C-alpha cells in the first residue's frame, strides 16, 4: 500500500495541455477517474512538513489535528470544468499565494491530508 503520507506527497507536492490536466494525470489522479478538486503546493517538502508544528486549528471535520501555515505559500488549485468527464478530464488552473491547512498524523508527525487554503 501507499501510506497516507506518501499519498499526500504524490497528490499535493510540486516543489488545455494545461498544468492541471498534465499534473493531475502524471500524479495518478486522473489516470483512473476525474477528481473534482486538487491543490498542488510549490514549496519544499520540508517547508510543507514544517506546517505540522505551526498553528493548530480545527479541521473542517471537527478533528483538531490540523495546522495552518504562518506564511502564504505558492499553490495551484485544479478544479474540474462543468462538462469534464472521464476519460477526458478537464481542469481550470488557478494560481494563488495562500496559507495552507493540512491534517497531520504519525511518528514522524507529517501531513496526511490537504484541508484547505486561506
Ligand atoms: Hg490520500
Ligand atoms: Hg493522494
Swiss-Prot record:
First and last residues shown, out of full length: 27 to 150 of 150
Resulting phenotype, residue 113 to A: Loss of activity
Disulfide bond positions: 20-78, 34-89, 52-104, 59-66
Lineage of producing organism: Eukaryota, Metazoa, Chordata, Craniata, Vertebrata
Name assigned to this protein: Ribonuclease pancreatic
Subunit details: Interacts with and forms tight 1:1 complexes with RNH1. Dimerization of two such complexes may occur. Interaction with RNH1 inhibits this protein. Monomer.
MF term (GO), any: lyase activity
Impact noted for substituting residue 12 to A: Loss of activity
Enzyme class: lyase
Entry's family note: Belongs to the pancreatic ribonuclease family.
Keyword hit for Mitochondrion: no
Record gene name: RNASE1
Biological role: Endonuclease that catalyzes the cleavage of RNA on the 3' side of pyrimidine nucleotides. Acts on single-stranded and double-stranded RNA.
Known glycosylation sites: 1, 7, 28, 31, 35
Reaction(s) catalysed (UniProt annotation): an [RNA] containing cytidine + H2O = an [RNA]-3'-cytidine-3'-phosphate + a 5'-hydroxy-ribonucleotide-3'-[RNA]; an [RNA] containing uridine + H2O = an [RNA]-3'-uridine-3'-phosphate + a 5'-hydroxy-ribonucleotide-3'-[RNA]
Main location: secreted
Enzyme Commission number: 4.6.1.18
Tissue: Pancreas.
Amino acid at each position: 500500500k501507499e501510506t497516507a503520507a506518501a499519498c499526500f506527497e504524490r497528490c499535493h507536492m510540486d516543489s488545455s495541455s494545461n498544468y492541471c490536466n498534465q499534473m493531475m494525470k502524471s500524479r495518478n489522479l486522473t489516470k483512473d477517474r476525474c477528481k473534482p478538486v486538487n491543490t498542488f503546493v510549490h514549496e519544499s517538502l520540508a517547508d510543507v512538513q514544517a506546517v505540522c508544528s505551526q498553528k493548530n486549528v480545527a479541521c473542517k471535520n471537527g478533528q483538531t489535528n490540523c495546522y495552518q501555515s504562518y506564511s502564504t505559500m505558492s499553490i495551484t488549485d485544479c478544479r474540474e470544468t462543468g462538462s469534464s468527464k472521464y476519460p477526458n478530464c478537464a481542469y481550470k488552473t488557478t494560481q494563488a499565494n495562500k496559507h495552507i491547512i493540512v491534517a497531520c498524523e504519525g511518528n514522524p508527525y507529517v501531513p496526511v491530508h490537504f484541508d484547505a487554503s486561506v
